[PDB]
Design a protein around this ligand. Sequence first.
Ligand SMILES: OC[C@H]1O[C@@H](O[C@@H]2[C@@H](O)[C@H](O)O[C@H](CO)[C@H]2O)[C@H](O)[C@@H](O)[C@@H]1O
Ligand SMILES: OC[C@H]1O[C@@H](O)[C@H](O)[C@@H](O)[C@@H]1O
Ligand SMILES: [Ca+2]
Ligand SMILES: [Ca+2]
Length: 270
Amino acid sequence: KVLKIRYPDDGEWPGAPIDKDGDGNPEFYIEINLWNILNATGFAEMTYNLTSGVLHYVQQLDNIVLRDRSNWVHGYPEIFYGNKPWNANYATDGPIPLPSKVSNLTDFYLTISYKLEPKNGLPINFAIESWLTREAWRTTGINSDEQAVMIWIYYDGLQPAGSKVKEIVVPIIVNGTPVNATFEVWKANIGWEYVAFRIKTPIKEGTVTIPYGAFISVAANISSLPNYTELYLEDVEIGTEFGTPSTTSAHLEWWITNITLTPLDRPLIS
Ligand SMILES: OC[C@H]1O[C@@H](O[C@@H]2[C@@H](O)[C@H](O)O[C@H](CO)[C@H]2O)[C@H](O)[C@@H](O)[C@@H]1O
Ligand SMILES: OC[C@H]1O[C@@H](O)[C@H](O)[C@@H](O)[C@@H]1O
Ligand SMILES: [Ca+2]
Ligand SMILES: [Ca+2]
């Protein structure tokens, strides 16, 4: 009734499926994903209680040495739905058919209930990420004619990659109240096109609903990629990037109590 994964005990890449009905198709998949840490003392552990539905991440890392300082952040511990295109991990037991071509997908709301506790000024964000690839089921990484979209609904001490492009308004719901929120749009080229939406009023805890197609429509419109609507929306990942090249100690704890994807009866891109 409790799933647990732990770094470094389970290796340098701990991860596990959440498959509550035991049917062999995970509803979500979790990864500790310390992708840019070469070595650290301490541990990071992610627990999911299958009765309460609470996902709890506890991280206490020190003596951090990065794989490549130019990649800036240290890792992105996360939970995701769909096909993560960097590896053979996937979760497709849900109402939205990911992966699917962006030209064929309906819009959906993404609602997350969570609480973030970075310790001692640790730079972090809480970001939702999607990869858009040329093939339907990619498992070996990302090419220069493909896109990452990120949506940061909390941050402290981290700036997205690239250059600011603009500000957009997006209607969201925060703690039960519909509100017009502002997101900065940032664009970079980092081996693939990266577009990040960073909220101007970070939300450290609570329940937030966002309309996914507002973000993907803007990422499509500012993209330099050809044939954007042929790309497949592989996944929806939710996690915390953390750290900078001068962070040597990273203590952080967070919780997620609910992720819901709600299909709408309208195209993703408008
Ligand atoms: O390396 C990928 C990560 O880049 C992070 O942005 C960095 C900026 O904060 C910093 O000022 O510049 C460096 C080098 O240009 C950037 O890499 C993004 O915050 C992360 O989302 C991204 O994964
Ligand atoms: O930066 C490239 C990518 O590295 C992979 O190893 C990680 O699992 C991804 O989350 C990350 O985005
Ligand atoms: Ca299942
Ligand atoms: Ca995968």
